């Protein structure tokens, strides 16, 4: 055990994680190589630098007292360790839908601004990564205050979780389930980014005089950094600055204990009283868990950045990359039509599970992608060209029956091809889930890969139905809708 050996290992980790991508065909090998080095460092370290003697629930009364003294709502709910979601809020009285039941004044928040005014200030003013990335700044703000026994935010920090279910905590064999999916590339990136950032800041803290007064100067472990970035990614929020002219990132105590259910966003910032405010998403009877709607994120985003998979996520989606090929004889015209419509020539679009499967922007792209030369000219020239562009994203106004048949044929074939790039089938995934006993983290990975394929399969079916509908219109010579 010596600081010189850790210094050698973090320098090696920094060089490893600063190399360019080796190509997608070797990203798994790179991932396992980085994991091996991270685990060697982690085994030579002492876990979290600061731990607390009490149990998590021992500190919730201090959280309530502290939040109360600073103007937050503390009546009408209690914290309960639920099996499905972990700790959350439970109503102790009936709460009506749309009732303002939770509010948190700005003084309680941890923000990039409070990070700047903290012991981290001097190093923040020097390091270009901290100034550019408020989320990393929040993460170091958390660590510095965690290790400061007299911190104003100790009541909040002592009630935070000590572990998360972000992919940073997954075993190698749990991530292995995601081989061949879209999501695993984001898992790879998160792991490499996090390891690179840990090694970079480890060296920066050692060399920068502005870091001399930080507790991190005496102890800063990989576990510290993984915990801090996972705390921030699973709980951070965008709020306006005090003057309302800019946005900043913040952790919001007490309210961020609410778990997620489907619905609408009911939390907003009140500038006049300078506090976060939450109205009830639905009626909550006494004894019922209080939920909020986190946002319209996909299950890939919930797994990677929030650490959970949400069954019956009505906003689930997968990505699909499309572009006009520069070998297309009509490339120049198609690119100009797309540019006039505000759509890039190449982009990553979404396929949605809830109807409709494609957005107005993807419909517009696909229509132009399949246009004939005569149709392109009608979107480029003359007194109706602008009108024709205006309707490109509108399912009710096709370019022509032929254009629709072609684009839905294309999407059906592409979604089918994408399904064929996965290592397992939908039926195999359901069999794994039914016949094996798995961890929470393993189930998150398998449900994620199942969900990608189920969205693609629904897209194939919806494109096939649409192809048949427009082929009927074409064969019946139906008059084209005119806007």
């Amino acid at each position: 055990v010596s600081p010189k050996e850790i210094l050698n290992l973090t320098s090696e980790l920094l060089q490893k994680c600063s190399s360019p991508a080796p190509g997608p065909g070797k990203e798994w090998e790179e991932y396992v190589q980085i994991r091996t080095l991270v685990e060697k460092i982690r085994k030579k370290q002492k876990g979290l630098s600061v731990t607390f003697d009490g149990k998590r629930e021992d500190y919730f009364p201090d959280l309530m007292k502290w939040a109360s003294e600073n103007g937050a709502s503390v009546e009408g709910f209690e914290m309960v360790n639920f099996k499905e979601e972990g700790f959350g809020l439970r109503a102790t009285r009936d709460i009506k839908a749309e009732e303002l039941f939770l509010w948190v004044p700005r003084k309680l928040l941890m923000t990039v601004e409070s990070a700047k005014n903290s012991v981290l200030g001097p190093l923040y003013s020097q390091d270009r990564i901290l100034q550019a990335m408020g989320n990393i700044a929040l993460a170091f703000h958390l660590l510095c205050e965690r290790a400061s026994p007299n911190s104003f935010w100790q009541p909040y920090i002592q009630t935070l979780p000590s572990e998360y279910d972000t992919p940073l905590y997954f075993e190698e064999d749990e991530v292995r389930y995601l081989q061949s999916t879209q999501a695993i590339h984001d898992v790879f990136s998160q792991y490499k980014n996090t390891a690179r950032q840990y090694a970079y800041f480890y060296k920066v803290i050692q060399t920068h005089p502005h870091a001399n007064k930080l507790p991190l100067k005496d102890s800063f472990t990989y576990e510290d950094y993984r915990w801090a970035v996972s705390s921030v990614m699973t709980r951070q929020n965008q709020i306006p600055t005090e003057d309302g002219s800019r946005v900043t990132l913040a952790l919001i105590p007490l309210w961020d204990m609410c778990n997620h259910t489907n619905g609408l966003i009911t939390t907003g910032y009140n500038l006049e009283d300078d506090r976060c405010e939450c109205v009830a998403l639905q009626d909550f009877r006494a004894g019922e868990q209080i939920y909020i709607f986190y946002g319209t994120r996909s299950n890939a985003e919930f797994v990677i950045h929030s650490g959970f998979f949400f069954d019956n996520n009505s906003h689930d989606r997968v990505k699909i990359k499309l572009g006009v090929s520069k070998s297309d004889r009509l490339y120049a015209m198609k690119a100009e039509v797309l540019a006039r419509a505000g759509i890039p020539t190449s982009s990553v679009f979404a396929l949605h599970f809830t109807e409709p499967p494609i957005s107005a922007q993807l419909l517009a792209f696909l229509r132009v992608f399949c246009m004939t030369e005569e149709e392109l000219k009608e979107h480029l020239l003359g007194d109706s060209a602008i009108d024709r562009i205006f309707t490109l994203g509108n399912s009710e106004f096709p370019v022509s029956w032929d254009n629709e048949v072609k684009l839905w044929t294309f999407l059906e074939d592409r979604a089918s091809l994408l399904l064929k790039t996965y290592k397992t089938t939908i039926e195999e995934d359901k069999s794994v889930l039914k016949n094996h006993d798995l961890s929470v983290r393993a189930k998150m990975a398998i449900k994620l890969r199942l969900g990608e394929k189920e969205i693609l399969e629904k897209a194939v079916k919806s494109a096939a139905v649409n192809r048949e509908y427009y082929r009927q219109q074409m064969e019946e010579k139906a008059p084209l809708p005119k806007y």
């Binding site: 989320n135 997620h260 910032y269 985003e301 950045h305």
Partner: peptide, 15 residues
């Protein structure tokens, strides 16, 4: 409308 809706755990870039 909510003038400043708060998305819990809004995704940020860590690259």
């Amino acid at each position: 409308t909510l003038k400043y809706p708060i998305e819990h755990g809004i995704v940020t870039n860590w690259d």
